[PDB]
Point group: C3
């Protein structure tokens, strides 16, 4: 039994599997609508740290069992938060923030597959993923202001995805929105009732490409998030390309192409 198989068995709310390059993290609490609580949050951190270490993981796929991806926040968990003081609340929030950050920075391509409702922190995960595909019934909602709250921890990622113009509407109205609108706003990349068929071509493309190059694409895009294009941007982009090209991995990618053979990454 592998470390993944052991973790899969010990996690309460998640499954996790690893086969042929592709790791999966699966929301496996359908009986409670995959609703988030402190345990789900923590289990997701653990699975992420597990697969980041793992050399056999080229891609991380996030999915969920049941009809709904997450109905968002567990009511019992919400009652507990309500009784918390500032500092306990801050610690909770910081763990949810650590979850989003580690996903967003995961040094490997991530694909999220979203069926039905994806409410609450789930939208953050989707916005933290590099590729997201939802089914036609997929449902979204930024509801916090209905409860005197705000979606603070997910807002940086959600705003990056959908933009300020749309965030200022949807975060203030707390209206529901559908799959097609999601697609337009670029919350998702594709709509397909067969989420497995829809993911295949992305998985195929991603397993073919340079692990190092994909990790560097991600740090590079990270460095550009601020929108600045000045001398330092120019110097840094030029240094990145020059470095990878002389790297072993850069060198192997080029040689494989010249020699018309498959790269051994």
């Amino acid at each position: 039994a592998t470390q993944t198989e052991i973790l899969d068995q010990q996690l309460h709310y998640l499954s996790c599997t690893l086969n042929g390059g592709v790791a999966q993290m699966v929301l496996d609490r359908s009986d409670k609508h995959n609703a988030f609580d402190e345990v789900m949050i923590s289990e997701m951190i653990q699975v992420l740290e597990h697969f980041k270490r793992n050399e056999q993981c080229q891609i991380l796929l996030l999915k969920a069992n049941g009809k709904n991806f997450s109905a968002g926040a567990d009511l019992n968990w919400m009652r507990k938060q309500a009784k918390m003081d500032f500092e306990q609340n801050l610690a909770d929030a910081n763990e949810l923030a650590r979850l989003m950050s580690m996903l967003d920075k995961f040094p490997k391509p991530t694909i999220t597959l979203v069926q039905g409702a994806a409410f609450g922190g789930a939208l953050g995960l989707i916005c933290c993923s590099d590729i997201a595909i939802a089914n036609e019934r997929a449902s979204f909602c930024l509801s916090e202001v209905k409860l005197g709250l705000i979606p603070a921890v997910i807002s940086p990622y959600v705003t990056r995805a959908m933009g300020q113009r749309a965030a200022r509407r949807y975060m203030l109205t707390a209206e529901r929105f559908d799959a097609q609108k999601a697609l337009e706003l670029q919350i998702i990349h594709d709509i397909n009732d067969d989420l497995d068929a829809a993911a295949q071509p992305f998985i195929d493309a991603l397993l073919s490409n340079s692990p190092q190059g994909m990790a560097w694409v991600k740090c590079l895009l990270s460095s550009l998030e601020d929108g600045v294009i000045d001398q330092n941007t120019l110097d840094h982009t030029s240094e990145r390309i020059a470095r990878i090209r002389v790297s072993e991995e850069g060198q192997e990618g080029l040689n494989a192409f010249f020699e018309k053979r498959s790269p051994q990454w």
Copy 2:
């Protein structure tokens, strides 16, 4: 007679009314195409400062009488600007800049309803609003470069809304664009010939939600405009959610939901 009714009577170019949570600022100079001059600018500042203070204002709705929202800049006003020296021009611009800033930062949801032409500073207002709905004949144009000018004061807001890729086209061509293109670029959120029916569902959603939470959504989105997502972003978002949750308002929103009752905000 209320302070609003008195202001409504004294303003030359605007109307203003207040009923049932909803304040309205209405461009009421149809005879001159709601064209902006120094007086319009100043009256709009006054109405904004009036409703920001007002505790009975949960939402601010901006609308205009006549067939056109604003044909943009008053010709007589333009002749005056032409004769101005640098410093007089700077003062004008700073007042227009103070108008946009105060609207953009207004701590309450704003909805703009745009019929026909919305030229000149009107586009800035629309880009400063949280929700904008236009009719099918709505017309837009960034014309300044046709006159050896630039739309400098509105550009930050307009750029935020439509993005750099589209700003660099439309600000350089000065071409007219239509409602549908507006919608695609996200200058507007909805298209409907019945602007009143179109606003209703947004008004209903907005009056239901936490005034404090909506104000905090707006400051938070403001803080994220730069695109940076670093340690401080993480610390600040975590501090915001923790704070509101323990607030009276946060607490009341949560309790109302647990108790399955309406929040008394």
Copy 3:
């Protein structure tokens, strides 16, 4: 024979012409699919520096001969890069970076017309142009990670155009995308099999407008790229409008309009 006619004759890979306000830079290496190498890069720099100086150039149009805009990077050039050490690579990259920067900052409206494939650095040029029109067969691809590389030098411009949400997909998958998707992502502004007819209305609009005002629109949009809207943004936008208005050019644009005559720019 003009300086342009002389340059046109001496360039190996480009043509260049100048007529009636409109300068053209033309990729003229169809036999090798307009593929980029060090010489193409350098020739493009020279043509840009040539037309920036030129007072008879109001607009710069970029186009290409043959069926394909650029198949991207020349294989012979790639073999050379592979053998380069860090510092030689850095110099290459810095020249490609200097090319994109000078185009992006060119103080005059640029229009790019893209037929078929536009792979590699070509996408950067397109993303550096103010207006881009492609035909229905136009093809795009960010392929670098297939070779253990990254599109580092073009990424700032490409990211500005299409956004982070889409960059993180396409830069990681290295998938091909088509004209329509390009249009949606705003990589292009229009789709038309008749690229010459499609450019005409933009050329007409651009030759009519203030050269100074268009140059200032561009610096101003540049200054706003970071997304910050603070006191200094406000002060700087107000100073720009006040300055141009009192300028000779500002003054002439206004007077021509008041006098219902054509501006003599």
